[PDB]
Amino acid sequence: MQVILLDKVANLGSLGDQVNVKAGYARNFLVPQGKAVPATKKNIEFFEARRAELEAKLAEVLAAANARAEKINALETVTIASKAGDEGKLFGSIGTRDIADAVTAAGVEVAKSEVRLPNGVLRTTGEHEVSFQVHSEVFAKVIVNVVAE
Amino acid sequence: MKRTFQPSVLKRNRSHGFRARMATKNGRQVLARRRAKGRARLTVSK
Amino acid sequence: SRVCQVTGKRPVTGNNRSHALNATKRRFLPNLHSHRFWVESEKRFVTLRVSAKGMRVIDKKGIDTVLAELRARGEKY
Amino acid sequence: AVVKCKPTSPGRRHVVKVVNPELHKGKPFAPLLEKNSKSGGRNNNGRITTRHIGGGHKQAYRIVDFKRNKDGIPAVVERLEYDPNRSANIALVLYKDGERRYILAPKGLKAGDQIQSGVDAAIKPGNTLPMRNIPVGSTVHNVEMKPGKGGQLARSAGTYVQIVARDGAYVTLRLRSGEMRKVEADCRATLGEVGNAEHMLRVLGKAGAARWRGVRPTVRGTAMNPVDHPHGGGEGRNFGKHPVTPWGVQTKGKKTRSNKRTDKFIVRRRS
RNA sequence: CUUUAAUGUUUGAUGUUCUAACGUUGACCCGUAAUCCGGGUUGCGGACAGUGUCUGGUGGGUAGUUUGACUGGGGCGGUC
RNA sequence: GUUUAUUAAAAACACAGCACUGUGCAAACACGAAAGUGGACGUAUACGGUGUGACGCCUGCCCGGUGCCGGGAGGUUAAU
RNA sequence: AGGACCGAACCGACUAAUGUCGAAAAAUUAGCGGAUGACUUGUGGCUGGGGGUGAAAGGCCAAUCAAACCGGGAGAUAGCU
Numbered sequence: 180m181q182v183i184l185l186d187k188v189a190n191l192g193s194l195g196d197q198v199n200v201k202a203g204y205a206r207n208f209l210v211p212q213g214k215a216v217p218a219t220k221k222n223i224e225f226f227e228a229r230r231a232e233l234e235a236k237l238a239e240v241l242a243a244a245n246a247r248a249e250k251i252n253a254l255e256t257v258t259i260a261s262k263a264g265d266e267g268k269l270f271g272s273i274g275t276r277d278i279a280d281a282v283t284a285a286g287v288e289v290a291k292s293e294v295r296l297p298n299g300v301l302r303t304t305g306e307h308e309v310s311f312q313v314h315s316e317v318f319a320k321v322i323v324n325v326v327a328e
Numbered sequence: 329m330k331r332t333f334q335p336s337v338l339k340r341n342r343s344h345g346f347r348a349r350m351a352t353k354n355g356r357q358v359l360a361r362r363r364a365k366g367r368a369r370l371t372v373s374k
Numbered sequence: 375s376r377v378c379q380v381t382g383k384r385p386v387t388g389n390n391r392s393h394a395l396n397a398t399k400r401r402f403l404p405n406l407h408s409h410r411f412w413v414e415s416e417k418r419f420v421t422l423r424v425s426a427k428g429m430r431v432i433d434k435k436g437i438d439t440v441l442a443e444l445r446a447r448g449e450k451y
Numbered sequence: 452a453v454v455k456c457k458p459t460s461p462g463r464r465h466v467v468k469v470v471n472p473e474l475h476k477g478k479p480f481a482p483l484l485e486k487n488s489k490s491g492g493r494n495n496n497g498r499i500t501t502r503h504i505g506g507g508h509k510q511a512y513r514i515v516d517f518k519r520n521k522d523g524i525p526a527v528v529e530r531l532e533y534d535p536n537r538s539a540n541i542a543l544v545l546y547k548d549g550e551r552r553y554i555l556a557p558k559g560l561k562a563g564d565q566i567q568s569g570v571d572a573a574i575k576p577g578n579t580l581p582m583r584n585i586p587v588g589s590t591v592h593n594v595e596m597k598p599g600k601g602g603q604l605a606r607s608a609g610t611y612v613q614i615v616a617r618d619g620a621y622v623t624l625r626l627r628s629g630e631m632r633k634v635e636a637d638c639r640a641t642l643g644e645v646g647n648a649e650h651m652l653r654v655l656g657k658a659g660a661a662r663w664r665g666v667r668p669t670v671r672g673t674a675m676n677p678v679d680h681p682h683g684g685g686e687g688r689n690f691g692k693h694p695v696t697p698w699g700v701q702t703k704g705k706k707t708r709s710n711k712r713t714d715k716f717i718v719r720r721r722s
Numbered sequence: 723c724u725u726u727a728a729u730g731u732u733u734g735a736u737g738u739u740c741u742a743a744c745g746u747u748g749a750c751c752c753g754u755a756a757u758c759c760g761g762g763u764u765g766c767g768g769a770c771a772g773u774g775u776c777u778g779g780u781g782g783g784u785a786g787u788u789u790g791a792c793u794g795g796g797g798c799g800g801u802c
Numbered sequence: 803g804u805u806u807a808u809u810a811a812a813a814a815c816a817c818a819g820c821a822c823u824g825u826g827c828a829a830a831c832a833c834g835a836a837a838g839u840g841g842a843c844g845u846a847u848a849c850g851g852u853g854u855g856a857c858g859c860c861u862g863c864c865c866g867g868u869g870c871c872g873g874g875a876g877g878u879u880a881a882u
Numbered sequence: 883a884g885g886a887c888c889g890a891a892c893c894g895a896c897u898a899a900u901g902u903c904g905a906a907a908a909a910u911u912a913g914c915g916g917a918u919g920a921c922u923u924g925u926g927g928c929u930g931g932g933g934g935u936g937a938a939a940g941g942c943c944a945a946u947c948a949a950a951c952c953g954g955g956a957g958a959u960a961g962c963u
Contacts, residue, residue: 180433202430202433203742203743203769204742206429206433206742206743207741207742207743207744208741208742208743209742210412211412211742212742217433217436219434264584268584270570270571271570271581272583272637276764299620300620329906329908329909329945331944331945332944332945333944336925338925338926339926342926375836376774376835376836385835396786398785401835402774402775403773403774403775403835404774404775405773405774405775406773406774407744407773407774408744409743409744410743410744418761419761421760425774426774456883459883459884459886460884460885460886460887461856461885461886462818462884462885462886463883463884463886464856464857465818465819465856465857466818485843487843490840490841490842491840491928492832492840492841493833493839493840493928493929494832494833494834494838494839494840494841495833495834495838495839495840496833496834496838496839496840496929497833497928497929497934498832498833498834498840498929498933498934499832499833499840499929499934499935500831500832500833500839500840500841501831501832501840501841501842501849501850502832502850502851503850504840504841506920512843514843515843536842536843536844537844538844538847538848539847595748596748596826596827597746597748597749597765597766598748598749598765598766599748599749599750599765600748600749601748603826603827603845604826604827604845604846605845605846606844606845606846606848607844607845607846607847607848608847609847610845610846610847610848626826626846627846627847628825628826628846630826630846632826635766637765637766645847647847648847649847650847651847652847654818654819655818655819656818656819656885657817657818657885657920658803658816658817658818658885658920658937659803659817659818659885659919659920660818660885660920661817661818661920662817662885662920663920667920667937668804668815668816668817668920668937669816669817669851669937670815670816670936670937670938671815671816671852671853671854671938672851672852672853673852673853674814674815674816674938675936675938675940676938676939676940676948677940678940678948678949679936679938679940680938681782681783682852683938690853693868693869693870694822694823694851694852694853694869695851695852696831696850696851696852697832697851698783698831698832699781699782699783700783700831700851701869701870702822702823702824702850702851702852703822703823703824703851703852703853703869703870704822704823704824704869704870704871705823705824705869705870705871706824706825706870706871707824707825707830707831708824708825708826708829708830709830710771710828710829711770711771711772712745712767712770712771712772712828713826713827713828715767715770716767716826717826721824721825721826
């Protein structure tokens, strides 16, 4: 399927290139998320007219805003006190709900889907590293030290 | 010697009554056929 | 029923022939599936029971155009 | 306790009874009861779908709390009761907050025993904890397929499962059938073994005993005519055929599991 | 041409990971005084399962049929 | 105890018990073009199928053939 | 306590005789089995024909069952009377 790309696709993203893609890939991922628009002999003239450069800056500022946001908290440290068990066996596994809420209350205002946990769900008690992706090409590292209560 | 026919008004009406026929389309066709034949008694009427 | 909501494909009866040409009645069924299509005009997902051919039709045309035809058909989606 | 009754008359000679002196001698707790209309093996179409079902004593349904979601509330075992719907006895438990509930009774329970749920619970039998907090190698019962589903394994009298290994977020359990199944660590389980382990020692004695238990007589395929069963026919007990189900499927050693969806959670099969 | 090897091409089998199709007879909220159904949030599986078209195997579970004539009755045997 | 209402009440059928086999729960299986329902508001000390038929002594040898279960060296093998 | 014992109602039908254009399209008379249970019964529901139901006889499904009844294809076909 010949489609025009808006966002930077890591593999074949080139700002509106007539590059074939699987129908399922565009149908289920690109179009619903706004990363591309189906163009068939009608929007090509339109893309090169108003999408050619007008939205290029609009897309870029989103990346610039994301880069600004992820540096809001220079400390980049998260401390949460949990009533862990006796010698391990933390009370209960916690994912993104509590940590995101605490960070939002005091720290960086970020959405739920932004937080990614590469080291499980924080089972063991101690120091852990969490990779935050505010953009495809922007990755952030945050150290979390859960302390037993 | 118990015989096949053991009368019961409630069972007769609820089985072959007018409203029983109208419930289904097959019963409605039964009434339609008997109207065409001109039968005086459309169904078993109490 | 097994009716595509886009192309209108419905099961069609037919025969299946053996080596001895014996004929037995069969039925051909459309390749129907339940799919959710994202519509930007109304900003939500719409679930349609569409065939694989219909899904190709939706891709070739616009989802908005297909929805308009469905509305003109007079059947709720 | 297992008691052998004297053969005062035929039908009592082979009766072996199981008597539990601590079972409650009275009516059950009404608020937790519900009617249980029999079906006789018929489905919504009215046809017989399961054979050899019908009749039997009327029995009410006890709402047994399998989920055990009352976290952090200590509870006390009021009494043990006979449940007609289950092989295992149930226990009526009163929570500190004034709520009564029914739970399966493990082997160790007795009147006045203390039980607790939630992760912050002890290791004594009767407490329910997520399987992540349960030490490996312990015996549990009433295990959950999925978090919050309720509990489906080791529910009969004298049944249990073994926790053998814990990898990542999944746990491996050995079921009473000898099969190893992989389950999520978030699922809850109850420590200990289901009680009434002597329930298997009864013999029912006579034909009427199985009759008022809801079981109807079973007729052998050979005794039937050819038109009714794949077996049957001929003069003088002729079989000359491979054993099969009434609907033609080959029984006596043919595997019928065809799922391809839950196979990822099966580590070993029965042997 | 026989004998071998750097980058790029078609690639297909296998393996790992991901989520956005799809499944959910998991939980929670709403329509709603509702164990149906739908929508929403989340969890778990996940391109698997399942379904359509085509195709190999199995298939008395079911169906339609066939199972000759002569003959010192017929059958058996023999013959055509 | 049940059975050929209306020529057969029995040694037939059932039976408690016994064994084999299938089934991990969206269970096997059954009725349904499907939804769904029974199994079961049960889950392996449970459920379905099959044979034998209380209880006591027991139940020997044979895997060639046909089924069923497992294997993969090699050969043959459809659609495409 | 008991699918315990004897025995009426009640349920069933082992033997004999009568009756076979009968009082009766399976009965009567005299005996006979069970009779607190796998019992029996009233009322009302559910299962529909290649289907139901069946402690299994090819039994029963309105006096009809190795495929009910009614209408239709249909004036089926009949090398036979």
